[PDB]
Design an enzyme around this catalytic site. Structure first.
Site, PDB file in Angstrom:
ATOM      1  N   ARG A 134      14.583  66.045  19.864  1.00  0.00           N
ATOM      2  CA  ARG A 134      14.801  67.191  19.083  1.00  0.00           C
ATOM      3  C   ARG A 134      13.621  68.545  18.487  1.00  0.00           C
ATOM      4  NH1 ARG A 134      17.672  64.920  13.887  1.00  0.00           N
ATOM      5  NH2 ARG A 134      16.855  62.922  14.454  1.00  0.00           N
ATOM      6  N   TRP A 165      16.850  66.430  29.980  1.00  0.00           N
ATOM      7  CA  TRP A 165      16.489  65.767  30.787  1.00  0.00           C
ATOM      8  C   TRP A 165      15.881  64.468  30.250  1.00  0.00           C
ATOM      9  CZ3 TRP A 165      13.880  70.537  28.918  1.00  0.00           C
ATOM     10  CH2 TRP A 165      12.650  69.932  28.232  1.00  0.00           C
ATOM     11  N   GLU A 195      15.800  55.650  29.392  1.00  0.00           N
ATOM     12  CA  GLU A 195      17.366  55.183  29.372  1.00  0.00           C
ATOM     13  C   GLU A 195      17.727  55.010  31.158  1.00  0.00           C
ATOM     14  OE1 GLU A 195      18.939  59.451  27.927  1.00  0.00           O
ATOM     15  OE2 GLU A 195      17.244  59.701  27.829  1.00  0.00           O
ATOM     16  N   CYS A 225      19.377  62.022  18.466  1.00  0.00           N
ATOM     17  CA  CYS A 225      18.789  62.196  19.419  1.00  0.00           C
ATOM     18  C   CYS A 225      16.682  62.603  19.001  1.00  0.00           C
ATOM     19  CB  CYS A 225      18.795  63.995  19.843  1.00  0.00           C
ATOM     20  SG  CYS A 225      17.750  64.417  20.919  1.00  0.00           S
TER      21      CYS A 225
HETATM   22  C1  HEM Z   1      15.126  67.901  26.611  1.00  0.00           C
HETATM   23  C2  HEM Z   1      15.367  66.664  26.449  1.00  0.00           C
HETATM   24  C3  HEM Z   1      16.084  65.341  26.055  1.00  0.00           C
HETATM   25  C4  HEM Z   1      15.968  64.136  25.878  1.00  0.00           C
HETATM   26  C5  HEM Z   1      14.709  63.872  26.064  1.00  0.00           C
HETATM   27  C6  HEM Z   1      16.578  63.597  24.658  1.00  0.00           C
HETATM   28  C7  HEM Z   1      16.973  62.704  24.997  1.00  0.00           C
HETATM   29  C8  HEM Z   1      18.071  61.905  23.926  1.00  0.00           C
HETATM   30  C9  HEM Z   1      17.453  59.799  24.124  1.00  0.00           C
HETATM   31  C10 HEM Z   1      16.396  59.209  24.679  1.00  0.00           C
HETATM   32  C11 HEM Z   1      18.897  59.600  23.275  1.00  0.00           C
HETATM   33  C12 HEM Z   1      19.436  58.429  23.366  1.00  0.00           C
HETATM   34  C13 HEM Z   1      20.057  57.887  24.428  1.00  0.00           C
HETATM   35  C14 HEM Z   1      21.227  57.161  24.805  1.00  0.00           C
HETATM   36  O1  HEM Z   1      20.423  56.245  24.379  1.00  0.00           O
HETATM   37  O2  HEM Z   1      21.807  56.642  25.423  1.00  0.00           O
HETATM   38  C15 HEM Z   1      19.309  60.970  22.839  1.00  0.00           C
HETATM   39  C16 HEM Z   1      20.044  60.981  22.557  1.00  0.00           C
HETATM   40  C17 HEM Z   1      21.296  62.319  22.667  1.00  0.00           C
HETATM   41  N1  HEM Z   1      21.298  63.583  22.656  1.00  0.00           N
HETATM   42 FE1  HEM Z   1      18.965  63.980  22.811  1.00  0.00          FE
HETATM   43  N2  HEM Z   1      17.622  64.532  24.309  1.00  0.00           N
HETATM   44  C18 HEM Z   1      17.563  65.777  25.218  1.00  0.00           C
HETATM   45  C19 HEM Z   1      18.254  66.723  25.420  1.00  0.00           C
HETATM   46  C20 HEM Z   1      19.194  67.252  24.250  1.00  0.00           C
HETATM   47  C21 HEM Z   1      20.650  67.996  24.178  1.00  0.00           C
HETATM   48  C22 HEM Z   1      20.235  69.785  24.856  1.00  0.00           C
HETATM   49  C23 HEM Z   1      21.322  67.984  23.214  1.00  0.00           C
HETATM   50  C24 HEM Z   1      22.306  68.653  23.007  1.00  0.00           C
HETATM   51  C25 HEM Z   1      22.833  69.755  23.307  1.00  0.00           C
HETATM   52  C26 HEM Z   1      21.039  66.490  22.745  1.00  0.00           C
HETATM   53  C27 HEM Z   1      21.894  65.510  22.185  1.00  0.00           C
HETATM   54  C28 HEM Z   1      22.141  64.530  21.923  1.00  0.00           C
HETATM   55  C29 HEM Z   1      22.765  63.748  21.288  1.00  0.00           C
HETATM   56  C30 HEM Z   1      23.990  64.003  20.672  1.00  0.00           C
HETATM   57  C31 HEM Z   1      22.205  62.601  20.841  1.00  0.00           C
HETATM   58  C32 HEM Z   1      23.328  61.204  20.548  1.00  0.00           C
HETATM   59  C33 HEM Z   1      24.751  60.644  21.695  1.00  0.00           C
HETATM   60  C34 HEM Z   1      24.879  59.374  21.047  1.00  0.00           C
HETATM   61  O3  HEM Z   1      25.138  59.100  19.542  1.00  0.00           O
HETATM   62  O4  HEM Z   1      25.820  58.781  21.714  1.00  0.00           O
HETATM   63  N3  HEM Z   1      19.780  66.676  23.613  1.00  0.00           N
HETATM   64  N4  HEM Z   1      18.639  62.187  23.686  1.00  0.00           N
HETATM   65  C1  LIG Z   2      27.256  55.515  21.965  1.00  0.00           C
HETATM   66  N1  LIG Z   2      28.348  55.171  23.641  1.00  0.00           N
HETATM   67  C2  LIG Z   2      27.279  55.905  24.746  1.00  0.00           C
HETATM   68  C3  LIG Z   2      27.495  57.120  24.433  1.00  0.00           C
HETATM   69  C4  LIG Z   2      28.682  58.115  23.994  1.00  0.00           C
HETATM   70  C5  LIG Z   2      28.558  59.492  24.237  1.00  0.00           C
HETATM   71  C6  LIG Z   2      29.486  60.042  23.631  1.00  0.00           C
HETATM   72  N2  LIG Z   2      30.988  59.705  23.227  1.00  0.00           N
HETATM   73  C7  LIG Z   2      27.369  60.575  24.037  1.00  0.00           C
HETATM   74  C8  LIG Z   2      25.943  59.072  24.343  1.00  0.00           C
HETATM   75  O1  LIG Z   2      24.409  60.532  24.631  1.00  0.00           O
HETATM   76  C9  LIG Z   2      23.655  59.644  24.927  1.00  0.00           C
HETATM   77  C10 LIG Z   2      22.816  60.922  25.734  1.00  0.00           C
HETATM   78  C11 LIG Z   2      23.443  62.448  25.132  1.00  0.00           C
HETATM   79  C12 LIG Z   2      22.382  63.379  25.811  1.00  0.00           C
HETATM   80  C13 LIG Z   2      21.352  63.035  26.046  1.00  0.00           C
HETATM   81  C14 LIG Z   2      20.177  64.284  26.774  1.00  0.00           C
HETATM   82  C15 LIG Z   2      20.849  65.543  26.754  1.00  0.00           C
HETATM   83  C16 LIG Z   2      19.249  63.702  27.362  1.00  0.00           C
HETATM   84  C17 LIG Z   2      18.786  62.646  27.483  1.00  0.00           C
HETATM   85  N3  LIG Z   2      18.409  62.745  28.592  1.00  0.00           N
HETATM   86  N4  LIG Z   2      20.106  61.884  27.092  1.00  0.00           N
HETATM   87  C18 LIG Z   2      20.987  61.792  26.723  1.00  0.00           C
HETATM   88  C19 LIG Z   2      21.856  60.866  26.095  1.00  0.00           C
HETATM   89  C20 LIG Z   2      25.255  58.121  24.558  1.00  0.00           C
END
Ligand code: HEM
Ligand SMILES: CNCc1cc(C#N)cc(OCc2ccc3c(C)cc(N)nc3c2)c1
Ligand code: HEM
Ligand SMILES: CNCc1cc(C#N)cc(OCc2ccc3c(C)cc(N)nc3c2)c1
Ligand SMILES: C[C@H](O)[C@H](O)[C@H]1CNc2nc(N)[nH]c(=O)c2N1
Ligand SMILES: C[C@H](O)[C@H](O)[C@H]1CNc2nc(N)[nH]c(=O)c2N1
Ligand SMILES: [Zn+2]
Lengths: 404, 405
Positions: free
Chosen positions: A111, A280, A285, A108
């Site tokens: 963070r 958000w 993305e 993420c």
């Molecule tokens: C507040 C603004 C936030 C932004 C701008 C943001 C941004 C991102 C981005 C760009 C990714 C990569 C997503 C992708 O390529 O599919 C990501 C992944 C992730 N985000 Fe954040 N996020 C935000 C909030 C949060 C919140 C609130 C949580 C949890 C409480 C969170 C948990 C995660 C997790 C666990 C991943 C990895 C998902 C995976 O491994 O597939 N995010 N985030």
């Molecule tokens: C790896 N395959 C794709 C994938 C699989 C799973 C699962 N299971 C979860 C994934 O989370 C992407 C994600 C999660 C949270 C987000 C938040 C809170 C904000 C944001 N801007 N982007 C976000 C993108 C992506």
């Protein structure tokens, strides 16, 4: 021992000592690195040690380690596990754990926001109908008329010899993907399977490119139930470009709220199989991955043609030019509609500040370089030139198998 | 399933298993507890003999004579040689195979589709810095070929016990000077400040342009390095212009045709070739994105964006992405116009996917460093972004080595 971590733009060096706190193996070995892999290949003592470690984390966080309440709470957890094989979190522990799991998420880039997370306790939920109500309230809170607020709703934990609470959808808002007989797909190809599950479970389908899917919600050992989201709850942003008028005519749009709903939340050994969380969007993305991936909306060639670019050769960089304008339209459109969004430059700049904060606070920060670096203009962002160390800390968000 | 890493392409949904990794005899930086894959530079006659035997085995497999009398005789000959001298020597055909294999084995190189076509110049007879210079000039002329570039490597004598190394001090045969200024700024290429100062300390009369070609600092065993100026007619350069932005040419940017890395160590069968410069042709993002737009390199992004009249006061204008794309286009268009070999990041990554499929069949896998293979602009628009990769060390290898000073 401890890895030396260098930023190659600034020449600055840190040492990660936080990684020593990892208790779970990732996929790499000295023989080969598997860091680019998307998914992992695959008693009471174990639970108790994870529970103890977490309770310790919690009381350390409120600066009350060794205190009377700390010792008692550890005894409660012990007594409960010993008698029942499991235990339960207090709401304040749950709030702390949810925030830590976000903080610990190596993929993420967002963070810097980790301490600002609204936590809805939905552990008193006993039916799919009840789940739907919480989910609706979650979306309402989180959307906030475009002034987006990060939130998580936590449904009851898994229990031994009982089915899980699950949300079948990968995100709370997704667009349908309809397979046409001629092999193509209308809508979002990433969602063909969930779309078909919905129809099979009684959903009357649309036939647009941006049909919002209903939710399949599952209470333990029950067939999933179908719930259509009230359209007024789902905020959407029509895409237009600030200088290219033909762009609006593409009829593109995206939803405001990124809310992932198929991941498992692990806190102190307890597992929450339904705990959807939203923040958000970062513009790439939508503009790069969702719209330009060849296996998603795949609009690159359309846009390049409307730009009268030479699609004959790769050396005209038609793809690169189109991608940039698409990302620009996303930023412009969201800003015009007063919906929170962050571009990849501002986001990665915030992430560097976050690395610095975390270095002082914990002596490191787990981070997955392949995911942190944006899908366009990588080396134009500071994170490209930053070395990173990836490891698993708990509390953690995890992948889990599909419930069907 | 199969007891080997499972590798998936997410664009196509296709799956492979890497069995080649089982051949890795050398550990990388990762452990089950933490991945260190993003780190740029992570940290005995019987040891020699085992590496030697493994390489000779690789050689005889490659010519399909594995188990033969000639195979066994060559093994005997290497053991004898190491027993009576402490080292051994490669036959010409073994050196050629080893050099190509080192390239084929390089996880960070997107250009490996070409690995079979490498002209190997045997310079193991070289005995002076003067002669190294002759060999290097010949390399450059052959490799440059007036713009129709040809991959080549020149191999100088191996490390020998109780004897100094042959070294090329410069990181590439062609590099622009970096002059530190009185105000703390740098004129030219900031990457090259140290080597520039070293050239001056060794008697070079420095220039003061943004694109002064550096002299070569060459070192024969147990001798001070000597200075050699490349005759300018040998160094092909390409002035940069843009196909539609007519002002871009006025910026006076340029780059050299030949990427020829000269500070890496070629290891084959435990033998170490401390001076073995190798060259190919550029992928356009190396010049247009990294060399020209890195903040700690020429850093021209804002200058270009200002000429383009972009809003550089806010990130959300995407001024950086816009400028960077046009700079890359100018690189491609200029090289094409000059008829000098170059490949764009799209064509290159596509050819790399072909290489992965070739190697999957030929060897059951291909070591690849994802962070280096995926280009520095437009990452997910290339097929390699969506391809999972397994990274491991195979030998023959090109390795980093400490600077001679
Ligand atoms: C507040 C603004 C936030 C932004 C701008 C943001 C941004 C991102 C981005 C760009 C990714 C990569 C997503 C992708 O390529 O599919 C990501 C992944 C992730 N985000 Fe954040 N996020 C935000 C909030 C949060 C919140 C609130 C949580 C949890 C409480 C969170 C948990 C995660 C997790 C666990 C991943 C990895 C998902 C995976 O491994 O597939 N995010 N985030
Ligand atoms: C790896 N395959 C794709 C994938 C699989 C799973 C699962 N299971 C979860 C994934 O989370 C992407 C994600 C999660 C949270 C987000 C938040 C809170 C904000 C944001 N801007 N982007 C976000 C993108 C992506
Ligand atoms: C023929 C055209 C070639 C192309 C288009 C090409 C492309 C590239 C690119 C883009 C990189 C990344 C460089 C960086 O970011 O600094 C690279 C690295 C590398 N190339 Fe190739 N290359 C070519 C030929 C060769 C040849 C002939 C050799 C050796 C015989 C070679 C060996 C290597 C090695 C060892 C690296 C990584 C060095 C390191 O670890 O720092 N390449 N190549
Ligand atoms: C300086 N940045 C780190 C760096 C350090 C060292 C060391 N020691 C070597 C490096 O090799 C990059 C390289 C090598 C060969 C190339 C060839 C033949 C062709 C091509 N187009 N690009 C190439 C790029 C890069
Ligand atoms: C193979 C590769 O790991 C895979 O495509 C990853 C690469 N980096 C990514 N980075 C982000 N942010 N999101 C992704 O889905 C991916 N996909
Ligand atoms: C920190 C990171 O490993 C470093 O900046 C890497 C990333 N990927 C790269 N990829 C290539 N091809 N060349 C590079 O110099 C780098 N630099
Ligand atoms: Zn790794």
């Amino acid at each position: 021992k401890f890895p030396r971590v260098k930023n190659w733009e600034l020449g600055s060096i840190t040492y990660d000592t936080l990684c020593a706190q990892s208790q779970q193996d990732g996929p790499c070995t000295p023989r080969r690195c598997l860091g680019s892999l998307v998914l992992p290949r695959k008693p009471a003592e174990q639970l108790l040690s994870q529970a103890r470690d977490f309770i310790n984390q919690y009381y350390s966080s409120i600066k009350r380690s060794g205190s009377q309440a700390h010792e008692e709470r550890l005894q409660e957890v012990e007594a409960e596990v010993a008698s029942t094989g499991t235990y339960h979190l207090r709401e304040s522990e749950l709030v702390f754990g949810a925030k830590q799991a976000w903080r610990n998420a190596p993929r993420c880039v967002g963070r810097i926001q980790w301490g600002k997370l609204q936590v809805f306790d939905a552990r008193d939920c006993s039916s799919a109908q009840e789940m739907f109500t919480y989910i609706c309230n979650h979306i309402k809170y989180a959307t906030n008329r475009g002034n987006l607020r990060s939130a998580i709703t936590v449904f009851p934990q898994r229990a031994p010899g009982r089915g899980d609470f699950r949300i079948w959808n990968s995100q709370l808002v997704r667009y349908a993907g309809y397979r046409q007989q001629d092999g193509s797909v209308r809508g979002d190809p990433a969602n063909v399977e969930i779309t078909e599950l919905c129809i099979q479970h009684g959903w009357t389908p649309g036939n647009g490119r941006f049909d919002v899917l209903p939710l399949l919600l599952q209470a333990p050992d029950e067939a999933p139930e179908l719930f259509v989201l009230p359209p007024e709850l789902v905020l959407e942003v029509p895409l237009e470009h600030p200088t290219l008028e033909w762009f609006a005519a593409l009829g593109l749009r995206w939803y405001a709220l990124p809310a992932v709903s198929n991941m498992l939340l692990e806190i102190g050994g307890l597992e929450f199989s339904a705990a959807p969380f939203s923040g958000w969007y970062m513009s790439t993305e939508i503009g790069t991955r969702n719209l330009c991936d060849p296996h998603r909306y795949n609009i690159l060639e359309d846009v390049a043609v409307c730009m009268d670019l030479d699609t004959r050769t790769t050396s005209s960089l038609w793809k690169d030019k189109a991608a940039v304008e698409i990302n620009l339209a996303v930023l412009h459109s969201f800003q015009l509609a007063k919906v929170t969004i962050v571009d990849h430059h501002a986001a990665t700049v915030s992430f560097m500040k976050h690395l610095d904060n975390e270095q002082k606070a914990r002596g490191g920060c787990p981070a997955d370089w392949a995911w942190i670096v944006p899908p366009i203009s990588g080396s134009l962002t500071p994170v490209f030139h930053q070395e990173m160390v990836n490891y698993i800390l708990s509390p953690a968000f995890r992948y889990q198998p599909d419930p069907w």
